Design a binder for this molecule. Structure first.
Ligand SMILES: O=C[C@H](O)COP(=O)(O)O
Ligand SMILES: O=C[C@H](O)COP(=O)(O)O
Ligand code: NA
Ligand code: NA
Ligand SMILES: [Zn+2]
Ligand SMILES: [Zn+2]
Ligand SMILES: [Zn+2]
Ligand SMILES: [Zn+2]
Lengths: 291, 290
């Protein structure tokens, strides 16, 4: 059912596994994410960015998710606003039916980040909605400790080396796991990893075989993601991996049949590739069989 | 708002215009169709084939449509089951919240077509849902008896069309004398299947993106207008939407091999589909009918 984000992440926090947070922008992404969760018996964190919400309309974003939840009522589902940029954006997500909201104010000084986050928290918590915030651009663990105590935010995303998109590491992957463990120790709350796509080898091969160009993009290796969960990460933001796998198959259908224009012929194999990415990620993070 | 199919088509029947009936298989198609109707102030017929319903799930097909109607509550919208093949399929659509259903038994002999259609009608009408059936080329006298006894709300008579892009291996031709006779004898809304036109700008867009249309031909615009003058009120349109949508997808794929933001593919695809629908609404005379 559609539940508070913290309902899912407190269990993951206490038992020591990661729940993937998967972005979607339309029905095909959402269906494949849900079939993955049903097939791996895994909780689901479903994420929509502000841009995704503008593309779908927030009424359709929430509406499609609610339909999917009633289709799979046995799966714990949180619907999460990814990188909300204003109080008003977060307030609109709360009013529309989101069960989790992120307020990203990490580009501000500590005092202004805490101020705005706290404002979001008391609004969201009044409405039964959980809150994510971000600290770092890396994190100061003692800032994190104070930030969490005073804001009462439900989960925290500390900067430990990742970044959005595919072009993460200009060389070898590097995450500061000592800093992670200290944050986790001092805050004792669920933590979140942004920019956590791995770009597996098969997904990249699929994309390049379809004539795509990834441009030397490298994600977080699987072994770093597992070490992250061992360090205390409980929500693993994942988007790029899904897009590459999906568009790989769309490119492939276009290439191999120039007369094909049935949309289902493009998006059925795209859905399948995306679902498989999600299933494997669920097993990697340790959320499989957790229902 | 979401309304009986006959509510939209009775008005079109009385006032002599055609309402496009546009197929969809996902959010992108649906959104672009609704924005077209909103911008042309036009009633909408939204339809989903059995295959589309298996792809989306009937719960999602109705659910997305109901969300879209709430976003544009001033637009008369009917949600239509396209080419239902069984009574049970039509019954599931009625229960799921469709406001119109088509039962296609035209491959049966007259007596069996009428019997199955009548059974669907009794079921659908008990639930406040309108019914389309198919006959056929059509015998105008079969049509007259068929409609009187079945009490179907609208009829698709075969007059020369076919589904898909490949409609006429020779010159395009429709039997308009047959059409008018059917209209005269039945005096109900009529439906035209296989009514995609494949406009030249949509074909040019598809070929420029590397697409192959394999010498396909659609109904000329002039034939669509003549069919509405002859009494056609519901004009089934699918292929045109697919080609315009997939033309832009192919183009995005071609012009940036590093693009994998789905919105970068489907925003222009939506726009192109929207414009096809907008121009079709103006062609058929449903624009500015709200
Ligand atoms: O915040 C991270 C998400 O991947 C954002 O996706 P977006 O490209 O829709 O903003
Ligand atoms: O009934 C005619 C429809 O255009 C067919 O659509 P479909 O290809 O989803 O069956
Ligand atoms: Na987030
Ligand atoms: Na139909
Ligand atoms: Zn992020
Ligand atoms: Zn971030
Ligand atoms: Zn048809
Ligand atoms: Zn037909």
């Amino acid at each position: 059912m559609l539940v508070k984000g913290n309902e899912i992440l407190l269990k993951a926090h206490k038992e020591g596994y990661g729940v993937g947070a998967f972005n979607f922008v339309n029905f095909e992404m959402l269906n494949a994410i849900f079939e993955a969760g049903n097939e791996e018996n895994s909780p689901l964190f479903i994420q929509a960015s502000e841009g995704a919400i503008k593309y779908m309309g927030i009424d359709m974003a929430v509406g499609m998710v609610k339909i999917m939840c009633e289709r799979y009522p046995h799966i714990p589902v949180a619907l999460h606003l990814d990188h909300g940029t204003t109080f008003e954006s977060c307030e609109k997500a709360v009013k529309a039916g989101f069960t989790s909201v992120m307020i990203d104010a990490s580009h501000h000084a500590f005092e202004e980040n805490l101020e705005l986050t706290s404002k979001v928290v008391k609004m969201a918590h009044n409405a039964g909605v959980s809150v994510e915030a971000e600290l770092g651009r890396l994190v100061n663990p003692k800032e994190a400790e104070q930030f969490v105590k005073e804001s009462q935010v439900d989960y925290l995303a500390p900067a430990i080396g990742t970044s959005h998109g595919a072009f993460k590491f200009k060389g070898e992957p590097k995450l500061d796991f000592e800093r992670l463990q200290e944050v986790k120790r001092l805050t004792n709350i669920p933590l979140v990893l942004h920019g956590a796509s791995a770009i597996p080898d098969n997904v990249r091969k699929s994309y390049l075989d379809a004539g795509g160009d990834l441009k030397g993009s490298k994600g977080v290796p699987f072994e770093f993601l597992q070490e992250s969960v061992k360090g205390g990460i409980n929500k693993v933001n994942t988007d790029t991996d899904l897009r590459i796998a999906f568009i790989a198959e769309v490119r492939k259908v276009a290439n191999e049949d120039k007369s094909q224009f049935d949309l289902r012929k493009f998006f059925s194999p795209a859905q399948l590739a995306l679902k498989n990415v999600v299933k494997e990620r669920m097993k990697l993070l340790g959320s499989a069989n957790k229902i």
